[PDB]
């Protein structure tokens, strides 16, 4: 009940872009800080959408449940539109860490039901069986208020 969208009845009309080469899952955040999945955008496709000012959005990889950057940030909130009515969010691949990128790539090229038949340290098992979950990254951003 802290990182939520305000019950706003105002127009914004945002345009998504998916400039990332992945299948983006835009997720709208409820007025109670809950993940709401919307239609997926195939790589390199952009759709003009409407929205209300004060609603909050973050993007994900629909299949590998990775995070993405909207205008170089993890979160998106609509700006002030008048005379610039189409506020525009451009989604790109985050500058991933080499560990977590390699962590992703093994998950895609191994069946997740094994993961433990690879000769790696036990600490490195719960790194790949960690899975970039949405609300997993939410708790981090709830703290990030200062």
């Amino acid at each position: 009940p802290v990182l939520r969208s305000v019950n706003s009845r105002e127009p914004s009309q945002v345009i998504f872009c998916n400039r990332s080469p992945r299948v983006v899952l835009p997720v709208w955040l409820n007025f109670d800080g809950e993940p709401q999945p919307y239609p997926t955008l195939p790589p390199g496709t952009g759709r003009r959408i409407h929205s209300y000012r004060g609603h909050l959005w973050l993007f994900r990889d629909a299949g590998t449940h990775d995070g993405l950057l909207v205008n170089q940030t993890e979160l998106f909130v609509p700006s002030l539109n008048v005379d610039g009515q189409p506020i525009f969010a451009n989604i790109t691949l985050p500058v991933y860490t080499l560990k977590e990128r390699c962590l992703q790539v093994v998950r895609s090229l191994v069946k997740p039901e094994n993961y433990r038949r690879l000769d790696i340290v036990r600490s490195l098992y719960e790194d790949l069986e960690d899975h970039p979950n949405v609300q997993k990254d939410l708790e981090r951003l709830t703290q990030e208020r200062i």
């Binding site: 019950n7 409820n30 007025f31 109670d32 809950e34």
Partner: protein
């Protein structure tokens, strides 16, 4: 009387605790909403929280007099709001969920 209780404790409650359900808890304030033509088109605004207040206070006598007050709000939203208006899409979601749980409905005492 158990049917005016399975609606109140189970059916009402799961619908009350829904994200799109917040405006459907209080009746319209046409002056602040900037539209006085609400009462002129809608003749039975007996819903939006009024459904709850009369349900605990046993004003609905049977298992169908109360359910019909539910349909009024859903249809009411359809009547005055153009099909595909965000407020309609919210009403459609509540009605969908209402039908999902009433299909295991108990016997009326």
């Amino acid at each position: 009387t158990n049917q005016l209780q399975y609606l109140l404790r189970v059916v009402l409650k799961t619908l009350w605790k829904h994200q799109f359900a917040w405006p459907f808890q209080q009746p319209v304030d046409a002056v602040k909403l900037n539209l006085p033509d609400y009462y002129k088109i809608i003749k039975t605004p007996m819903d939006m929280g009024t459904i709850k207040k009369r349900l605990e206070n046993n004003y609905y006598w049977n298992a169908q007099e109360c359910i019909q007050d539910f349909n009024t709000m859903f249809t009411n939203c359809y009547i005055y709001n153009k099909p595909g208006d965000d407020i309609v899409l919210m009403a459609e979601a509540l009605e969908k969920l209402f039908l999902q749980k009433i299909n295991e409905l108990p016997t009326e005492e």
